[PDB]
Chains A and B, each alone.
Chain A
Amino acid sequence: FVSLDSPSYVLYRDRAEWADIDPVPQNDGPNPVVQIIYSDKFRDVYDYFRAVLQRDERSERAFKLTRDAIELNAANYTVWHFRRVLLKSLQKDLHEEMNYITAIIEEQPKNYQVWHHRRVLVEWLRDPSQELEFIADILNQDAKNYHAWQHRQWVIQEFKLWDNELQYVDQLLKEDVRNNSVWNQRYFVISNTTGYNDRAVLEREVQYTLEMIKLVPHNESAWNYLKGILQDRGLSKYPNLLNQLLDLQPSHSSPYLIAFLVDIYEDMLENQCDNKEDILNKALELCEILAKEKDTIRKEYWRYIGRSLQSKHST
């Protein structure tokens, strides 16, 4: 009906249809701490919310009241829980509620309660038909919204909507190849569909990632994804990768490439590689270069790696 900012808005203490119930003030004690000096409108709504909650009044007026309580503080999870109790008790149209939560999330996209409420509605309706499009709109405003990506992964996994997500991932990577959330979604989609054991898929992914690295050599996300899809089997299991990186080093001696080389050497030494002494020496040389010049912010980490290597492979 009327909104909190509407010119005709009336405080609940002045509404005739609410005169039959006494408001319940919040008891902060005689000597309050972290006491918020609420506006008259805020205290008014919550004094009545406390009243309906205390009486557990499953009514239409209570339902409408929660809408105002939510506008005042959308992070009040108690109000949201009660609203869901009312949705069921009153047998409210859940599609109408979906339209409501859609508008609310657009206004406060980083709130935990609003996304959970939406998930509950989708679960109750078992209808994910509006999800991918809605989430895409939120991500169009903030391509890294954590809650949006999390909800997206849940919808896709719960309702098996994998068919077009890799295409979506490619589109967003084109827009911003530095979007780490999209690289994570890439791993999410592939690991849950084809998997990475298919050597054809793995090669496709390594090639793609290397192409992205060549285009933007200092984009950490691509480097991290390359390591991510190869680390479990062991970086030393891919001999050609070492050669290729060694060729680009002279022209692309970034801290990312140098660190990746150390990572390869670490695994090589862990798998009884040949020319152990030579590999250890090369790894230690790079650790020093990283600690003293190329990646000084991580000096302590690189010094630790150097000592670790010596504790495991000196012989």
Chain B
Amino acid sequence: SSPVWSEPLYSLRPEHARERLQDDSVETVTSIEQAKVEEKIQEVFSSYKFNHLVPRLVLQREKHFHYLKRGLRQLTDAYECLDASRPWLCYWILHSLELLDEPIPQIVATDVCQFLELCQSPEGGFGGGPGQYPHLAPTYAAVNALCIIGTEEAYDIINREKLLQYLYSLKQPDGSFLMHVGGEVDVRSAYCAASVASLTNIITPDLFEGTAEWIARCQNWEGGIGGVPGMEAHGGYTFCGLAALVILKRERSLNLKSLLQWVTSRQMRFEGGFQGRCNKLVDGCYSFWQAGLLPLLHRALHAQGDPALSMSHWMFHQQALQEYILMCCQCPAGGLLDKPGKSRDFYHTCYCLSGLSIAQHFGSGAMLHDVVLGVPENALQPTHPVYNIGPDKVIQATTYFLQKPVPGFE
């Protein structure tokens, strides 16, 4: 076959050029923008090929580590726009470090715990910063961050009694949840609530009454799920919807056939990455929101006894996604990004790596099959498809909280 120092790539096959956009000689803003991206991506792909010599791809772990380590402590005023999302920054950075198997010093871990405690609201839940009103987004992030740290100190920071009361204070009669008091409603809330409620063992029989049905109403003609009933299928909202249903054990409420066909169609034939909506551009962060749906669908179908499911691969091109992330989404100075030409940020660093991990690791029952493209060191730690934190962290947290009673309920 091939010597160990050369690894043929899917994106470099001669026939891959046939995957370039065919605009039928009818130009619109959509095709013009798509063609511009493909042109740049082809240039990038070609820079990794030296005729028959194709060096193994490398995840710049050390560069990413230094970028993350610095951000966990300090951020430039360029992040003032995220002053109401500090727990998100904690989660994005800690999860990235977790995926890279970079240890978190005990002192830094305690400091994160203390900071998130300051973000916790007396009414329950966490806000975007100290003194801010609680909101389900930073609440979801804070809980995930605390679970990644996984110490009893971290677990006990969460005021479970008030958290459950807070969730009740956001619950609507139609099954949906507000993101915060007097705030907006969309499927993100159902997932944020289901995620934190299941991890901390505070689910009551009535908490999610009608929620599964509301989420199902969000699935549209495309097969994917929109933010609210009637809206366009979107990768981020679809991940929220399916993940929430998996937690509620109500995945069957959806048409899984149309959902599967929709998400698989979101992988770009030329770029290898995923787009968030049909006819929109590729973006590294959808490596998680979209690809993450495949392990969820695998689990859902496996629970139904689907005799046709693979026992070694997810139903998306795992190699092509790794090729897109490794060749197109890494910032040479550390951090990951949307696509070539875009600047790095902690959000894309988190989700590009999360998607890379999903693409590298397949697991079902007693079957495990890894596909780590490039040098062996590229292998990342696995991530749980529902919560997007390490599976070990999910088990440790759920076990810990299951030892506590549901707040004021039997």
Contacts and interface: CB of A to CB of B under 8 A. Distances in A.
A27 B79 contact: no
Contacts of B315: 300-301, 304
A151 B233 CA distance: 16
A37 B76 contact: yes
Interface residues of B, number: 85
A117 to B, nearest CB: 10
A104 interface: no
A276 interface: no
Given A150-B228, A176-B30, A144 B277 contact: yes
Classify the interface of chain B: helix, strand, loop or mixed: loop
A270 B328 CA distance: 42
Contacts of A13: none
B278 interface: yes
Contacts of B335: none
B402 to A, nearest CB: 29
Contact of A153 (B231, B278, B310): B231
A96 B86 CA distance: 33
B338 interface: no
Interface string B223-234: 000111011111
A35 B227 contact: no
B182 A217 contact: no
Contacts of B314: 300
Contact of B279 (A149, A153, A221): A221
Interface stretch (A4-12, A14-22, A223-231, A237-245): A223-231
A295 interface: yes
A153 B306 CA distance: 37
Interface string A73-112: 1011110010010000000000000000000000000001
A46 B131 CA distance: 11
B83 interface: yes
B308 A311 contact: yes
Given A34-B75, A34-B86, A153 B230 contact: yes
B279 A73 contact: no
Contacts of A221: 278-279
Contacts of A27: 118, 130-131
Q: Which of B82, B127, B186, B278 has the most CB of A within 10 A?
A: B278
A278 interface: no
Interface string A200-226: 000000000000000111111100110
Contacts, number: 220
A81 B181 contact: yes
A77 B28 contact: no
A298 B267 contact: yes
Contact of A29 (B75, B118, B228, B307): B118
Interface in B11-32: 19, 21-24, 26, 28-31
Interface in A157-188: 157, 175-181, 184, 187-188
B80 A26 contact: no
A179 to B, nearest CB: 7
Interface in B91-111: 93, 107-108, 111
A58 interface: no
Contacts of A46: 83
A301 B320 CA distance: 14
A31 interface: yes
Contact of B111 (A31, A153, A177, A184): A31
A143 interface: yes
Nearest to B21: A218
Contacts of B306: 308
A38 B83 CA distance: 9
B317 A73 contact: no
B176 interface: no
Nearest to B28: A176
Contacts of B72: 33-34
Contact of A149 (B93, B231, B233, B317): B231
A36 B80 contact: yes
Contacts of B108: 33
B307 A75 contact: no
A184 B222 contact: yes
Contacts of A35: 73-75
Given A54-B131, A73-B83, A150-B186, 8 more contacts: A37-B76, A42-B77, A73-B84, A76-B132, A144-B277, A180-B277, A187-B220, A218-B22
22 contacts: A33-B115, A39-B80, A42-B77, A46-B83, A81-B133, A84-B182, A112-B179, A120-B182, A177-B28, A179-B30, A184-B222, A216-B26, A217-B22, A218-B21, A221-B278, A228-B222, A229-B221, A296-B317, A297-B269, A298-B265, A299-B317, A307-B308
Interface of B: 19, 21-24, 26, 28-31, 71-77, 79-86, 89-90, 93, 107-108, 111-112, 114-115, 118, 127-133, 135, 179-184, 186, 220-222, 226-228, 230-234, 258, 260-261, 264-265, 267-269, 272, 277-280, 306-310, 313-317, 320
Interface of A: 26-29, 31-39, 42, 46, 50, 53-54, 72-73, 75-78, 81, 84, 112, 115-116, 119-120, 143-144, 146, 149-150, 153, 157, 175-181, 184, 187-188, 215-221, 224-225, 228-229, 231, 254, 295-301, 303-304, 307-308, 310-311
> Which 5 pairs show the lowest CB-CB distances between chains A and B?
A228-B221, A178-B30, A307-B308, A176-B28, A184-B232
